[PDB]
Design a protein around this nucleic acid. Structure first.
Lengths: 131, 46, 343, 101, 217
RNA sequence: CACGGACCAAGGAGUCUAACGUCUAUGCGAGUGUUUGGGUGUAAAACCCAUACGCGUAAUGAAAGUGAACGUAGGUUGGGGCCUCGCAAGAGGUGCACAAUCGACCGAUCCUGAGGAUGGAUUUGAGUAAGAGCAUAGCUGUUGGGACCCGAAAG
RNA sequence: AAGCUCGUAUCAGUUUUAUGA
């Protein structure tokens, strides 16, 4: 059982501050995923490629979905094509950030996300490849 | 002129009363629901 | 675009001209990085010290041996000297060699990431425009006519110290200099005799863009460090890794400050550098939570502190009154006697 | 912000706290209401903030709006409070209209 | 410019700046064009509102600011049996300004400042509408304006908008619609069309369905 | 048993460093590392950076080589979540990481022999599934250094 | 100690019935 984050970054403690609140007051178990997820260590917040985002929206009916990654979005040069999709994360590498702006969609923070999706309506949570 | 409530504070009274009039209706229908409950228990113990 | 900063002149009056915010001042105020960056950077201006390689081995002492009814520590030879027949060599022994002698090649300087290093100063600079942050760091800034205090470029030209403190009196830092000055104390250490005899408080930092005699003007007035906007130290900005030194900027410095760091509009100047991005949007949480938004999709609240149920165990059997809350029948059991039943 | 001023001064140094032996903290900022350094009690974290001070025998009700954050000199905005304690409390409640209880 | 006089740290210049703008807006022909210069004007008038945290001049300023939409194109000239004759056209851009700015700035407004901007968003939607002419009965205006409210904020299908924003209109429209002092152009209940829509804000969807349609009017 | 202790004061023992790791934190991220050096300075600080280099970014082999899409970079099964219906209980859809099975491409196999073409025989892989790294710091591990301190017959 | 799946029908220094030398 993991309790509170081992991080020192005070902007991250501000997120938890919100999500520990939204966990217990909303009772949509979306929140109880993210809030547990925030705490995770830096070898277990593996970085999500903008490629692994593009794969995840090929998934059927997911044309209108705010994909969320508690970790970081990384830029990829391999893929030309990218959907107009709203993407929330902790870190957007300058590269990636751009790769999403030019494609039309928004790159958004977990608290932007917490507002737009309080209970977490119509979301998709991805994970970076642990092994 | 004269001063108004803040719009957040104005919303409070609106969503307190949506609960307070909700809760005192829940409570008063439970006071009867336990009065009836009591009477089931009494007749069972006998 | 943001608000825009007013510029005052060296009499203390607001001139109609006002400068835009540089938006280095919208960096993340990360006190965590400032600390872990300061520390290393503070250890960088350090000297070595060691103890003398010879010292301790400048004795010709011999271990007495087994079965001699005295302890087996190496003892000095000789005679009639009183240093004869006594303990040298060994950390315990008076005049012996100190345990694992300090060497010169301890790591003294500390390698930092150049990016981290920079991030730090941005945070530092940000926090230097917050006022409350600055008031908590020390710095009597109750009378400064605005933060960040930006001053007319004719401040650089002032030659004679006497006039340039009157630049500051008019601006209002009259107090902050008297915070220093009054604070002069003897060091409380052995620093009384390692040339650290005195210590006073850290005054305002002045930031000029190009010198016309400001650096010398103020080099006397106690505590008042100035810096060229091109450098801008962490150690002057976060003194002792406490965020937010009170800073006077000059009009020219302030304008250039945008070039130095960069915004959305302008380039950078530091090569391929960009000011860092926030992992939140608003550095405030209680605007997210006391919302119209979130409070609309939420189950209602408690009392904050529960009205405890069952504090003390009233037992039935004794106490009739509880024996009526459990089981209402027992009133009926007592009106009919029921224990006393005839057949 | 403020929630970013607090948690810095809260831990990481508000160079005017007194640690009582008790453990208790005490914001000696000559402006706060409760001598204690506590969120929504420190005049530094919180942005709307009132107090009474005395000056001479004259007891003023200083108030600090968050409009004025730009300009630390005209920060506080004081008011002489009558001196019949009865009117004075009513005097107070007037100004506090619609603040935190 | 006007933005910088309106977003001044000096109070006394922001009083005068606004009055000059009022004369300038009355002048009208100059401001005939450019969505972005209008957008900006609004951004400028945002900072002026933010410099009033005292309790009753923000109660003065918000109303005067909304009041702009009125003085800006007055129905004394009266468009009758007429289209969008540069009074109406001017209004339909100037609304879009406010509703851009206030959509852009919903996150960035601070707790103790949020009181103002809600009061401003009330006064503005009341003083909008107020100019649909002298009245709200403007058949060729209304359907245009219902496409320059609908297409910008009450849409909800846009997540780009801050779903706390409609929620506020939702509460307020009825108490200020009746600050008109019966029937009119209410179409407006766009609400019916979206209560309706799937793939939106489950929050608004249930905030409209409880706050709007529970009331009889 | 035995070893130590008459008493009191002061001293008095897991340190530093090098290599190599683990974990956590921070920065950035397919990159990453300013500090050999130069420029600059209020000067052993701070602030700037050219060219390189280091480690990583695209693999299968033994002398020679080749090159990763039949593809929503798969077919199913689960699978945190999310979406529809239901007061709920449930059911239905979509399925992340991951796991299991069927496979394929690439290289290498067992043959057929037009110097090795072509088709079959089957598996294999720090293989690709569609990058996670780099650096600084902390706690700490192993090994070398006098190496927790004191003590030996020596040449 | 951390990570992943579960949070259960995951088991137990236990008894019973069933089925053999």
């Amino acid at each position: 059982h993991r309790t509170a984050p081992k991080s020192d970054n005070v902007y991250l403690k501000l997120l938890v501050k919100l999500y520990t609140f939204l966990a217990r007051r909303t009772d949509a178990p979306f929140n109880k995923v993210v809030l547990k997820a925030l705490f995770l260590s830096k070898i277990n917040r593996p970085p999500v490629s903008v490629s692994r985002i593009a794969r995840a929206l090929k998934q059927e009916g997911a044309a209108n979905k705010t994909v969320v990654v508690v970790g970081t979005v990384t830029d990829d040069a391999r893929i030309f094509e990218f959907p107009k999709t709203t993407v929330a994360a902790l870190r957007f590498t300058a590269g990636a950030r751009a790769k999403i702006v030019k494609a039309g969609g928004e790159c958004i923070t977990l608290d932007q996300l917490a507002v737009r999706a309080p209970k977490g309506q119509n979301t998709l949570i991805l994970r970076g490849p642990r092994n | 002129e004269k001063i108004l409530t803040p719009e957040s504070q104005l919303k409070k009274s609106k969503a307190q009363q949506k609960t307070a009039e909700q809760v005192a209706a829940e409570r008063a229908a439970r006071k009867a629901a336990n009065k009836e409950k009591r009477a089931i228990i009494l007749e069972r113990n006998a | 675009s943001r608000p825009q900063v007013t510029v005052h002149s060296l009499t203390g009056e607001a001139t109609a001209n006002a400068l835009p915010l540089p938006a280095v001042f919208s960096a993340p105020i990360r006190p965590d990085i400032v600390h872990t960056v300061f520390t290393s950077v503070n250890k960088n201006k350090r000297q070595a010290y060691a103890v003398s390689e010879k010292a301790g081995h400048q004795t010709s002492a011999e271990s007495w041996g087994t079965g001699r009814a005295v302890a087996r520590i190496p003892r000095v030879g000789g005679g009639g000297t009183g240093r004869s027949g006594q303990g040298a060599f060994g950390n315990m022994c008076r005049g012996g060699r100190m345990f694992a002698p300090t060497k010169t090649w301890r790591k003294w300087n500390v390698k930092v990431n150049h990016n981290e290093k920079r991030y730090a100063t941005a945070s530092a600079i940000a926090a230097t425009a917050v006022a409350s942050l600055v008031l908590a760091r020390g710095h009597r800034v109750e009378k400064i006519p605005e933060i960040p205090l930006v001053v007319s470029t004719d401040l650089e030209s002032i030659q004679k110290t006497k006039e340039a403190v009157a630049a500051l009196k008019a601006v209002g830092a009259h107090s902050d200099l008297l915070k220093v000055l009054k604070s002069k104390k003897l060091r409380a250490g052995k620093g009384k005799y390692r040339n650290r005899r005195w210590t006073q408080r850290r005054g305002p930092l002045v930031v000029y863009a190009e010198d016309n005699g400001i650096v010398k003007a103020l080099r006397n007035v106690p505590g008042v460090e100035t810096a060229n906007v091109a450098s801008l130290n962490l150690l002057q900005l976060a003194p002792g890794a406490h965020l937010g030194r009170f800073v006077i900027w000059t009009e020219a410095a302030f304008t250039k400050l945008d070039q130095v760091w960069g915004s959305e509009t302008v380039a950078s100047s530091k090569v391929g550098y960009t000011l860092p991005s926030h992992i939140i949007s608003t550095s405030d949480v209680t605007r997210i939570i006391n919302s119209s938004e979130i409070q609309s999709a939420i189950r209602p609240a408690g009392q904050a502190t529960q009205k405890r149920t069952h504090v003390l165990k009233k037992n039935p059997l004794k106490n009739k009154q509880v024996l009526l809350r459990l089981n209402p029948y027992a009133k009926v059991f007592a009106a009919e006697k029921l224990g006393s039943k005839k057949a | 912000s403020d929630e970013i001023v607090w948690q810095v001064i809260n831990q990481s140094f508000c160079s005017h706290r007194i640690k009582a032996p008790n453990g208790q903290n005490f914001c000696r900022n000559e402006y706060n209401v409760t001598g204690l350094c506590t969120r929504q009690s420190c005049p530094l974290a919180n942005s709307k903030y009132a107090t009474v001070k005395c000056d001479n025998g004259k007891l003023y009700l200083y108030m600090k709006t968050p409009e004025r954050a730009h300009t630390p000199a005209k920060l506080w905005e004081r008011i002489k409070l009558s001196k019949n304690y009865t009117k004075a409390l009513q005097q107070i409640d007037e100004h506090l209209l619609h603040w935190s209880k | 410019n006007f933005v910088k006089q309106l977003s001044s740290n000096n109070r006394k210049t922001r009083v005068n700046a606004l009055e000059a703008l009022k004369k300038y807006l009355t002048a009208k022909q100059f401001k005939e064009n450019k969505q972005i210069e209008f957008n900006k004007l609004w951004k400028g008038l945002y900072y002026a509102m933010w410099f009033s945290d005292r309790p009753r001049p923000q109660q003065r300023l918000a109303n005067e600011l909304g009041e702009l939409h009125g003085l800006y194109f007055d129905p004394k000239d009266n468009s009758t049996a007429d289209e969008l004759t540069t009074n109406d056209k001017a209004f339909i851009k100037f609304s879009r300004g406010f509703w851009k700015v206030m959509c852009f700035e919903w996150f960035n407004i601070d707790r103790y400042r949020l009181d103002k901007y809600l009061l401003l968003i009330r006064r503005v939607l009341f003083s909008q509408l107020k100019y649909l002419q002298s009245r709200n009965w403007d058949k060729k205006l209304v359907d245009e304006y219902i496409k320059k409210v609908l297409r910008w904020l009450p849409l909800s299908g846009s997540p780009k908008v801050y779903t706390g924003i409609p929620i506020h209109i939702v509460d307020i429209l009825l108490d200020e619609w009746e600050r008109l002092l019966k029937k009119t152009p209410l179409d407006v209940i766009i609400f019916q069309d979206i209560v309706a829509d799937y793939n939106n804000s489950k929050v608004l969807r249930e905030k409209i369905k409880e706050d709007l349609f529970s009331d009889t009017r």
